[PDB]
Subunit: 205 residues, 3 copies
């Protein structure tokens, strides 16, 4: 009913108010008091969001990264993703660096964070079908193991990120990097022939 | 109780009567009126069968291919498949170009369509154990990705067909081609060491 | 309530009494009468244990191997396995040649038998994270397919044993050999980044 002002998290960060508002509109992170003040409830909501989106540490602090990610998730361009006729469509919003999945006109996987091709390695827009799935793929070019590999376009694929996903300057080299939990879930959910619909443009690419 | 004569399918094809009879004996495609006349019920049954057996389009037309497939399924040589002592036995009837699975004296996977080796590439008869499973196998010989690969004999394996399975002249080159739904299901069901029992002979090979 | 003295198993083996006692303490193999006499109940318990631990044949005979395996399972060094902070920890007790799994301070996979590196090929002790998973791995060094491959240290990995696991002189060459049932279960249970904690020393290595 009312905020618990005694909590074990930091004093409210600069973006507390805007983050609270954004998370409340997402409507999946529990009780939120949109007042710009940190509370036990707001801290729990922020930590839950941070854990889900792989923000490390998940310490409840309403920092710039956490607000930026929350806004990207909230602004995911649902109306810009062309759904394929058959199977599922993996919607890859390059502009917001988010991903969701649709089947038969309904979202079956809610937006999550991704990291796509950095400057010089931009992920090619288009409609691409998954044609290779490997539990772990050895990249001959990059000399690295890529978990939960799903190739959709000439070696551009979905896979578990091998570096911290929120560092924009170290990846990707064309692939769609995913958090471990999301990559595993998508590996189980998606079929051969499902469409990866890549649209927009990653800022700075 | 009685056929619905008003339907959105074509006027009955030449093999309507025989197809209705065959599907009724299969006893898994719903209400059928074995009268040689197309109805809403018979059309639904035929479409369901066509979808299950990967006949494209599944438009409810009692054509030659659909009857031929239905008869192959119905005539699957259950008594010609030697069951292995341990694990499951994948029964590959080369004569009828069908496949089913038995375990502990009972069928756990009902007959489905396959395409095995064409003339010059006939699939070798015998009792063969699955010893390699790959989510996707790259064939070095044929330069193609083969989904849900299960190798049982020197590179002759189960996998998802890469071309329309009902075209007899374009495959296989020795492997047992399967429909996508069936290949995935068999990949999940079958274990290392399960026996692939290949018998009969593909007509024209 | 009382032993059924009429059974279809052999006259009691030399280690009947000690095996009965060990299996009773394991407390998962049903009714046991710890009297040194074979019975229908004791035979059933011994066969169940033999089947679970891949002792072939599982004929209910209280032989040396069966007692040795039972004692290894019972003496598994639970307090010697350092649990990792994140994910699951696969505890590999080289001294007892057994394996179990812990998560959040609790065992989620009870001890089973393994075979690790033989003399000259001893499995390296330490804390190692699973970084490659393959349904079947082709060993270039040993020219063999290894099912349910989970690489944790420079090609030392978990996989299904390719030879009878209870023959100490024919393996392994560094890997942790597992029974088929256990390897499949661990392949499904374990994640990338789970820790393989290898400790102790295989006797004679």
């Amino acid at each position: 009913a009312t905020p618990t002002t005694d909590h074990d998290c930091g004093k409210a960060g600069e973006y507390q108010k805007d983050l609270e508002t954004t998370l409340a509109s997402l409507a999946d992170y529990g009780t939120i008091f949109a007042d710009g003040k940190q509370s036990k409830e707001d801290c729990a909501a922020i930590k839950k969001f941070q854990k889900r989106m792989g923000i490390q540490p998940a310490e409840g602090y309403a920092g710039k990264l956490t607000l930026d990610v929350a806004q990207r998730i909230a602004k995911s361009s649902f109306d810009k993703c062309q759904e394929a006729k058959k199977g599922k469509t993996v919607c890859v919003d390059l502009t917001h660096q988010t991903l969701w999945v649709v089947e038969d006109g309904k979202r079956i996987f809610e937006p999550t964070v991704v990291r796509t091709g950095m400057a010089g390695y931009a992920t090619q827009p288009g409609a691409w079908k998954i044609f290779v799935k490997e539990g772990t793929h050895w990249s001959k070019k990059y000399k690295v193991w890529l978990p939960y590999w799903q190739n959709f376009n000439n070696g551009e694929g979905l896979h578990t990120t091998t570096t911290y996903i929120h560092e924009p300057w170290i990846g990707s080299h064309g692939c769609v990097n995913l958090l471990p939990s999301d990559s595993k879930k998508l590996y189980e959910m998606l079929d051969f022939g499902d469409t990866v619909q890549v649209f927009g443009n990653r800022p700075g690419t």
